[PDB]
Amino acid sequence: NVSDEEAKEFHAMFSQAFTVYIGVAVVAHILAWAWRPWIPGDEGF
Amino acid sequence: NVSDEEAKEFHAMFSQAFTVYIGVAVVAHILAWAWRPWIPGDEGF
Amino acid sequence: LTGLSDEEAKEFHSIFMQSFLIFTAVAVVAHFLAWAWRPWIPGAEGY
Amino acid sequence: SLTGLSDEEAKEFHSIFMQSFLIFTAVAVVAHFLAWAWRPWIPGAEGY
Amino acid sequence: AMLDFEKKYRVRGGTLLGGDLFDFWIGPFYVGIFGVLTAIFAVLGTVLIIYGASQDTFNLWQISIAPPDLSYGLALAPMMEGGLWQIITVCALGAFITWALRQAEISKKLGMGYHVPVAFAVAILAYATLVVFRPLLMGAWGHGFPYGILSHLDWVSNVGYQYLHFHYNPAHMLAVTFFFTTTLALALHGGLILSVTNPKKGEPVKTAEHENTFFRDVIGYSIGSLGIHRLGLFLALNAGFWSAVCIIISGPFWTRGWPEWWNWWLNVPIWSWG
Amino acid sequence: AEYQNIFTRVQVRGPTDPGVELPAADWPRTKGATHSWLLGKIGDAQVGPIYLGTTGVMSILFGIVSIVIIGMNMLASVDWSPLEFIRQFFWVALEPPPPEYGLSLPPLNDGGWWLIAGFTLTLSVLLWFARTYNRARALGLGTHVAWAFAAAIFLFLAIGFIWPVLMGSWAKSVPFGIFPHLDWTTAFSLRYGNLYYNPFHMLSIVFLFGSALLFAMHGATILAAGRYNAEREIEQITDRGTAAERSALFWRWTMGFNATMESIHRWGYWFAILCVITGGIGILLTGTVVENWYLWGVHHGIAPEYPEFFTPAVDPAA
Amino acid sequence: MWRLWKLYDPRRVLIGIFSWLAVLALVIHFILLSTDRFNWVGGAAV
Amino acid sequence: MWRLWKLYDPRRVLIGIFSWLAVLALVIHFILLSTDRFNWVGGAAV
Amino acid sequence: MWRLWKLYDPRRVLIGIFSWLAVLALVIHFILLSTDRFNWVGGAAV
Amino acid sequence: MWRLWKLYDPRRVLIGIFSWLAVLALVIHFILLSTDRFNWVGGAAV
Amino acid sequence: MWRMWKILDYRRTVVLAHVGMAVLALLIHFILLSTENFNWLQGNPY
Amino acid sequence: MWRMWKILDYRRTVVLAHVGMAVLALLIHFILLSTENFNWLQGNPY
Amino acid sequence: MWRMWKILDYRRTVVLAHVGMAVLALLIHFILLSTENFNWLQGNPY
Amino acid sequence: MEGTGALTDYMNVAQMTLYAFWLFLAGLIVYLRMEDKREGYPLQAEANENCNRTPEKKLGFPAPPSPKVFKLADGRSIQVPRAEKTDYELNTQLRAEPTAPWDGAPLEPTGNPMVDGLGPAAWAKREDEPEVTHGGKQKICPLRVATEFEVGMSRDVARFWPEIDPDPRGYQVLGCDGKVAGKIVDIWVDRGELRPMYLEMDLSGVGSSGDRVLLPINFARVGYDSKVRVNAITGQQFTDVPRLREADRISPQEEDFITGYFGGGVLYAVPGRTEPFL
Numbered sequence A, B: 001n002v003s004d005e006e007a008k009e010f011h012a013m014f015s016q017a018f019t020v021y022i023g024v025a026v027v028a029h030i031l032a033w034a035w036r037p038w039i040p041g042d043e044g045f
Numbered sequence C: 001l002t003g004l005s006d007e008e009a010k011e012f013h014s015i016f017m018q019s020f021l022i023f024t025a026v027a028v029v030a031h032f033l034a035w036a037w038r039p040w041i042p043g044a045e046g047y
Numbered sequence D: 001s002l003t004g005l006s007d008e009e010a011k012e013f014h015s016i017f018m019q020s021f022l023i024f025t026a027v028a029v030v031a032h033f034l035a036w037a038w039r040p041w042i043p044g045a046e047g048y
Numbered sequence E: 001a002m003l004d005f006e007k008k009y010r011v012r013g014g015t016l017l018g019g020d021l022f023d024f025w026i027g028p029f030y031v032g033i034f035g036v037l038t039a040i041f042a043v044l045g046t047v048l049i050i051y052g053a054s055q056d057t058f059n060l061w062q063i064s065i066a067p068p069d070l071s072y073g074l075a076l077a078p079m080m081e082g083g084l085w086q087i088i089t090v091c092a093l094g095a096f097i098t099w100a101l102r103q104a105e106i107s108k109k110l111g112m113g114y115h116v117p118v119a120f121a122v123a124i125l126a127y128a129t130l131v132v133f134r135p136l137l138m139g140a141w142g143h144g145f146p147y148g149i150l151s152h153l154d155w156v157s158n159v160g161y162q163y164l165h166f167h168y169n170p171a172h173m174l175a176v177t178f179f180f181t182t183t184l185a186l187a188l189h190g191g192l193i194l195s196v197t198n199p200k201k202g203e204p205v206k207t208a209e210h211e212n213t214f215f216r217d218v219i220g221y222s223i224g225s226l227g228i229h230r231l232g233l234f235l236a237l238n239a240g241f242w243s244a245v246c247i248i249i250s251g252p253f254w255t256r257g258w259p260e261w262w263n264w265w266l267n268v269p270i271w272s273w274g
Numbered sequence F: 001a002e003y004q005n006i007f008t009r010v011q012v013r014g015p016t017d018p019g020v021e022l023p024a025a026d027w028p029r030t031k032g033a034t035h036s037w038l039l040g041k042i043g044d045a046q047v048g049p050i051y052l053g054t055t056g057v058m059s060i061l062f063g064i065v066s067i068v069i070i071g072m073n074m075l076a077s078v079d080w081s082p083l084e085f086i087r088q089f090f091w092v093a094l095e096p097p098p099p100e101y102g103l104s105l106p107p108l109n110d111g112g113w114w115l116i117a118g119f120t121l122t123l124s125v126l127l128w129f130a131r132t133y134n135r136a137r138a139l140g141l142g143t144h145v146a147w148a149f150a151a152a153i154f155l156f157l158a159i160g161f162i163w164p165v166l167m168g169s170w171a172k173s174v175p176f177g178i179f180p181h182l183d184w185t186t187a188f189s190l191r192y193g194n195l196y197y198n199p200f201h202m203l204s205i206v207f208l209f210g211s212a213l214l215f216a217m218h219g220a221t222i223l224a225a226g227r228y229n230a231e232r233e234i235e236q237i238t239d240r241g242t243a244a245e246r247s248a249l250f251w252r253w254t255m256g257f258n259a260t261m262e263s264i265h266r267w268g269y270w271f272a273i274l275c276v277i278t279g280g281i282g283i284l285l286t287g288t289v290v291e292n293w294y295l296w297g298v299h300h301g302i303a304p305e306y307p308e309f310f311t312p313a314v315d316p317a318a
Numbered sequence G, H, I, J: 001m002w003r004l005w006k007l008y009d010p011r012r013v014l015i016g017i018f019s020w021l022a023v024l025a026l027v028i029h030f031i032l033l034s035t036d037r038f039n040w041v042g043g044a045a046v
Numbered sequence K, L, M: 001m002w003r004m005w006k007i008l009d010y011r012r013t014v015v016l017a018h019v020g021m022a023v024l025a026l027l028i029h030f031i032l033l034s035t036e037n038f039n040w041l042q043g044n045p046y
Numbered sequence N: 001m002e003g004t005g006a007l008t009d010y011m012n013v014a015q016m017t018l019y020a021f022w023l024f025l026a027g028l029i030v031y032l033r034m035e036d037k038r039e040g041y042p043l044q045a046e047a048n049e050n051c052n053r054t055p056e057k058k059l060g061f062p063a064p065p066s067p068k069v070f071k072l073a074d075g076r077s078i079q080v081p082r083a084e085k086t087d088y089e090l091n092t093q094l095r096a097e098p099t100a101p102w103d104g105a106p107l108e109p110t111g112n113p114m115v116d117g118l119g120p121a122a123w124a125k126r127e128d129e130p131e132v133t134h135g136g137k138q139k140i141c142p143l144r145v146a147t148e149f150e151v152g153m154s155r156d157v158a159r160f161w162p163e164i165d166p167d168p169r170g171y172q173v174l175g176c177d178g179k180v181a182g183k184i185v186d187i188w189v190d191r192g193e194l195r196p197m198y199l200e201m202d203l204s205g206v207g208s209s210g211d212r213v214l215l216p217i218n219f220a221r222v223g224y225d226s227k228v229r230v231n232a233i234t235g236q237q238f239t240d241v242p243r244l245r246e247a248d249r250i251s252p253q254e255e256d257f258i259t260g261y262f263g264g265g266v267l268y269a270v271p272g273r274t275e276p277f278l
């Protein structure tokens, strides 16, 4: 029942929210990795 | 009930998935046996 | 869609963001005080 | 068809579904190659 | 497939969340959003339980997912030292809560009251008492019971004997009384309905006047067709509620032997007689 | 904001109900029947009349003698002190014979009063079974209630009479007291190795917990469908209304399967009596064909094995 | 194989698959956290 | 104060009062019996 | 993002958001109490 | 004695008998197993 | 063997097959994890 | 891929995503708190 | 003995016979497994 | 393992007694499940549910038992499941359209679902003859024809503390939106259970003062302010509540009509009731 125009409009809002959420998550993970890497080596951390 | 064509259409759909699923399963078991055979001898593994 | 005109939704989205901004602004200030008291990101040696 | 989808819509859904599955599997393969490079999960005869 | 009268009831609406997205049936089951959540929680918890079985034993009775040590306190434990139990506990709580929320949607869709989800919430409250409320009050998740068919019986035994005689627990005495009374009420109610609708062969199906007459003949009182269902729900829910009370006061609110709790009765100035 | 069907708001009082007329061989009912507003909030407000027949009256006489014997022995145990009787009310009992007497008749003050009290109490419940049986037949009902009661009597007789006879001593039977019979319940589990490991004790708990579960479900379902007159269950069985349909559909949509309005009472009926039937069987099995239920559980591979946490104790006399 | 969607509703299979993938991803990540060798946050050595 | 009896049912007041007196007299008499000093039938010595 | 309020009732969104904040704030506060470093009322010394 | 079959349904009687025979046969076989002398699978010596 | 789908409904069999194989695939993988020689995550000597 | 919002209701998905993401984020933060090397509140040496 | 099928419903009997014989066959095999002389899996000396 | 109760080297009496009960319990569960299938079976498998595209009857496991015959007191024998109740359900044409063509999709009502009988508004097919008591009187009847009944279980409570023993005759009826639909003019009582089943009310607030309509007691909140509040339906929707064929009698079919209509207001009384919280 949902038309193409509103479906694209829903995707427009979703894309904006997704990229903002992704950006903070990527930045948070860069900071967390800079703080302490979570992939242990052969001998651990 | 269903016609000969619909039954054959379903079985063609079933034969595609059965072949791929059994093919992956057979390849997986060949690799698994090459790794560690699961049939022990009289003295064990 | 729930009963709400563009004028009312736009009016709500202005108060909502300002309320969100004020709430976050106080929270950021509260975290500045909390960090100045005791930082919560340890170093390699710990605390 | 007991779904309402016509033949062309069934084909349209299948094309996106297969593409989404392949992209999901491709990311998974990349994840497993990175995972294997970190620590392999198939032990040898003497173990790890 | 559906019951021959089911078609006119499978309508849209009544959901709490999810709406049209999850409002459909798979076979006889209504799904809803909470059905997806309760299925995810149920499968995840069961598969984690089966993994815990794989690491200890596959014997159905000997499978045991034990909580962490008391030394861990309220912290999340490592997976093989009680952390798996903690993950399954939150999955089980999620599964139970989504189950009752799913029943609320089904109740609303059928125009029924929310009595069933609320009555089930009493059972959820009792379970949450065992694994959340009592462990929280005592300060460690290790006070919860292990997830095992036979291992959690040993937990009940040892916890009951931590107070040297659990039969003397006053709330436990009341809760057992409700448990015994509700199955007595169920036997009476189940039998009475069957006796009326399945009388001696040849006789017609009796009426509600026979039901009142029978129990007034036997014990002098009849609670009625509406009263018995109120009484049955009351007895069952008090059995659930006082079960939670009896275990919540065992350790957070009483650390001594339960028989010693009755010393207040023995020292009442009315009947000291010494 | 909706009527929760918890208490009756509006009540109507007609004339007191004499009841369905009995065949012209039963005793007349009593002529005392009243209406209680408090009981009308929950259900039917009428109290009385009650039927007193041959079996009903004889059951009371045996029951009174049992209660008098128990009560007088309790009162004599505290030196006839009503104050000490209230103080020791939960602790007093009529003690069974000591083990030295076996199954023989013991002296009155050494278990004899217990055996007489047990005998008359057994007669009263047996006559009460016949009273319940006859009342159902007199009104032309089925005897389901009587047979549900007979299942309860089976556990009563298994615990107190059948199992002690199989063990060969009245001492193993249970004293007539509140805390003393809880002590018997615990000492039973201690003596025979954790009755938690008795499979029939497990099953009896399944149906005990399942009975409360079923009545919680059924009681809530009927109250939730009370908008559609669900509590009138006889009419819903012979003429399925929308309340029976919604009740059946509620559980079908929930857990995939459902009962009928009649069949849920069969489920509740059998769950209640299986709790008490399996319980009686489990009590008969212990001591007779199983000595230690934990060791039996180990023998059948059901006892869990725990890793080390402490230094195990070693029996000094081993 | 496109005829599979003439039998199963796309929405119901998407919910079924996403639920299965969510459950499966959690189980494997949790199973790895149980094992010391693959507990990345645990940081065990080889 | 006589307006009380137009407002309250005299029977339920008297039954309520007599019940309270019956219980209170019994409790007080029992309380004295429990005490060594005031147990008149025990015959204790001050 | 003003069109989000044409899709949801603002009252219900605020109830959900406010209830989430209440649970979040309590958990974080009680987590800090459980810590031997951020327990402010417990007199923890670093 | 053939009049018995007009008093009772032949099917109902046969099911009652056959169930009685099945339960009794199981009981006697297990009673013999419990005894030391008549346990055939145990291979006891008399 | 296309005659199978004139007897058994193909749509319900596929769902039955997928759910049933899901349980079996998990069950066998878990059985191997219980063993010593086939737990690939533990990596015990063969 | 705007076509995904034809199959699935968008606004119902948004609520489901927020509730689901809340559970996942809490789960991961709690996992890190249980670990020795990533408990930022306890601050163990790396 | 074909009159047995006018008294007994043949369709019901065959299903009950298969289930009843399944129970009996499983029981007897399990009885032999619980013995020492006839447990073919353990292979004790005879 | 030696001692009394031993059956073999491993089997003992308590183990075999347990397996005897497992066999009995399995048989009982089969019997109980068969008793569960005396209403609503065999299942109607609609065309969209099967690849053969034809409606089918499904029995399930265990299959439904033989039909059960109830002897009724008036002199009738009714076979359960009833033929006419099933015949009505599989012949009526619902005024609803499934939201999606596949099986399991919910129905979207086309007309007014409250009066058409969809979902919570649905009614069962029941007998149109009003029930009678064992004595022979009319079972459900208003207080005007049943003069032996008085309102209020206790005269003293209803007199001196009337809040907790109310007499709702003469009260006002309020809809879910506060609309004053009418005024209670009578109470219908069940001579078998001695309970108020319905509250008869005029429609003076939304119709005529002479139009009578029945409000089920379980759909009515009888407050302490001489008001009766009906959260089920709007005050204006009282005008469409099904009317009695006879002004002094109500049949089991009529009871389902009335309780079905008010139950329809759980989802359909006002816009938004059928929608989720979020």
Ligand code: BCL
Residues within 6 Å of the ligand: A013, A014, A015, A017, A018, A021, E040, E044, E087, E090, E091, E094, G022, G026, I001, I004, L013, L014, L015, L016, L017, L018, L019, L020, L021, L023, L024, L027
């Ligand atoms: C002012 C405007 C609104 C708002 C307007 C919107 C709009 C419009 C959208 C979002 C969307 C999102 N918003 Mg928002 N959002 C707001 C501000 C925020 C803030 C913040 C703190 O400021 C955060 C963190 C978020 C976060 C989010 C995400 C939930 C989502 C983006 C990711 C996504 O695509 O999900 C997709 C990911 C999934 C669906 C994965 C689902 C995970 C499943 C459910 C896992 C469940 C299993 C579970 C973990 C099992 C537990 C077992 C355990 C053992 C217990 N929003 C405010 C409140 N937001 C987007 C969205 O949700 O689209 C769907 C979107 O379109």
Ligand code: BCL
Residues within 6 Å of the ligand: B013, B014, B015, B017, B018, B021, G001, G004, K013, K014, K015, K016, K017, K018, K019, K020, K021, K023, K024, K027
């Ligand atoms: C491409 C679109 C769909 C898809 C389209 C199809 C189509 C079309 C078909 C399949 C079929 C199959 N698909 Mg598929 N399938 C997909 C991708 C997959 C993937 C994957 C990871 O990519 C896997 C592993 C599978 C797996 C499968 C198998 C279940 C099945 C093929 C084997 C078979 O014939 O079973 C046959 C075996 C049985 C029927 C036996 C049934 C087993 C019962 C339930 C007994 C098991 C008991 C169990 C052991 C109990 C556990 C123990 C407990 C303790 C009690 N599919 C995608 C998602 N798939 C075929 C199929 O299902 O045919 C039946 C088929 O026709």
Ligand code: BCL
Residues within 6 Å of the ligand: E096, E123, E124, E126, E127, E129, E130, E155, E156, E157, E158, E159, E160, E161, E165, E166, E167, E172, E175, E176, E179, E239, E240, E242, E243, E244, E246, E247, F185, F186
């Ligand atoms: C030494 C042992 C002590 C003793 C120690 C204890 C301890 C310890 C406890 C009890 C508890 C109880 N004891 Mg005690 N108790 C003793 C002797 C007795 C005797 C007796 C005859 O002697 C009786 C009748 C009882 C009876 C009771 C009840 C009052 C209570 C159990 C019911 C309950 O908890 O409901 C509550 C019901 C639940 C918690 C069930 C929860 C339901 C959940 C929400 C749903 C689960 C769904 C499931 C996962 C679905 C499965 C999947 C599907 C099947 C497919 N005890 C002896 C003396 N007892 C328990 C209690 O009261 O705590 C609450 C308890 O912890």
Ligand code: BCL
Residues within 6 Å of the ligand: E156, E180, F067, F070, F121, F125, F152, F153, F155, F156, F159, F176, F184, F185, F186, F188, F189, F194, F195, F196, F200, F201, F204, F205, F206, F208, F275, F276, F278, F279, F280, F282, F283
């Ligand atoms: C430490 C204690 C032991 C324990 C020791 C025992 C012993 C011993 C027994 C049980 C029994 C039972 N236990 Mg246990 N039990 C334990 C822990 C539990 C727990 C728990 C959560 O921990 C639960 C839920 C239970 C529950 C149960 C029930 C399933 C079962 C009682 C059924 C019943 O309703 O009898 C109550 C009903 C009756 C006894 C029948 C009543 C009918 C008669 C006719 C009543 C007549 C009334 C009379 C006329 C009134 C006037 C008399 C005069 C005034 C004197 N036990 C632990 C392991 N348990 C009983 C059983 O069946 O064992 C398998 C039993 O004998």
Ligand SMILES: CC[C@H]1c2cc3[nH]c4c(c3C)C(=O)[C@H](C(=O)OC)c4c3nc(cc4[nH]c(cc(n2)[C@@H]1C)c(C(C)=O)c4C)[C@@H](C)[C@@H]3CCC(=O)OC/C=C(/C)CCC[C@H](C)CCC[C@H](C)CCCC(C)C
Residues within 6 Å of the ligand: E038, E041, E042, E043, E044, E045, E046, E088, E091, E092, E095, E096, E099, E103, E116, E117, E119, E120, E121, E122, E123, E146, E147, E148, E149, E150, E152, E236, E237, E239, E240, E241, F209, F212, F213, F216, F217, F220, F254, F255
């Ligand atoms: C409070 C009064 C009584 C009561 C009421 C009650 N129970 C109820 C209801 C009500 C009103 C329902 O509506 C609901 C229902 O739908 O019943 C059919 C239910 C229910 N009560 C149930 C069980 C149950 N009730 C119990 C007790 C009681 N229920 C009380 C005595 C018990 C006991 C005493 O042990 C049990 C086992 C279910 C049949 C059902 C709710 C089922 C449910 O929520 O299922 C969700 C899906 C799952 C598969 C659950 C998975 C959970 C986890 C992910 C995994 C397992 C974790 C668990 C901790 C394992 C524990 C194992 C060991 C303890 C052996």
Ligand SMILES: CC[C@H]1c2cc3[nH]c4c(c3C)C(=O)[C@H](C(=O)OC)c4c3nc(cc4[nH]c(cc(n2)[C@@H]1C)c(C(C)=O)c4C)[C@@H](C)[C@@H]3CCC(=O)OC/C=C(/C)CCC[C@H](C)CCC[C@H](C)CCCC(C)C
Residues within 6 Å of the ligand: E180, E181, E183, E184, E187, E188, E191, E218, E219, F059, F060, F062, F063, F064, F066, F067, F121, F124, F125, F128, F129, F132, F145, F146, F148, F149, F150, F151, F152, F272, F273, F276
């Ligand atoms: C399915 C098993 C469950 C069950 C079922 C069950 N019990 C039953 C029944 C059933 C089906 C009955 O029909 C029967 C009954 O009457 O129920 C209302 C009964 C019953 N279950 C009872 C009790 C009971 N049931 C219990 C348990 C259970 N009952 C199980 C949980 C327990 C427990 C948990 O221990 C108890 C204590 C009784 C209330 C009743 C059986 C009544 C009976 O046997 O009466 C005779 C016995 C006597 C001791 C006689 C007493 C006489 C009075 C003391 C006379 C008083 C003096 C004077 C006459 C009064 C007037 C005074 C004057 C001054 C005017």
Ligand SMILES: COC(C)(C)C/C=C/C(C)=C/C=C/C(C)=C/C=C/C(C)=C/C=C\C=C(C)\C=C\C=C(C)\C=C\C=C(C)\C=C\CC(C)(C)OC
Residues within 6 Å of the ligand: F067, F068, F070, F071, F072, F074, F075, F105, F115, F117, F118, F119, F120, F122, F156, F157, F159, F160, F161, F173, F174, F175, F176, F177, F178, F181
């Ligand atoms: C002084 O008091 C007065 C007189 C004022 C009145 C007061 C009475 C009071 C206070 C009574 C109090 C009673 C109480 C508290 C009773 C408590 C009872 C309890 C809790 C009992 C619980 C369990 C008891 C059981 C299960 C007993 C079972 C005994 C049985 C089944 C005995 C059977 C005995 C038989 C069948 C005897 C057979 C005799 C033969 C002839 C066979 O022996 C040779």
Ligand SMILES: [Fe+3]
Residues within 6 Å of the ligand: E189, E193, E229, F218, F222, F233, F265
């Ligand atoms: Fe009922």
Ligand SMILES: [Mg+2]
Residues within 6 Å of the ligand: F175, F180, F183, F184
């Ligand atoms: Mg003692």
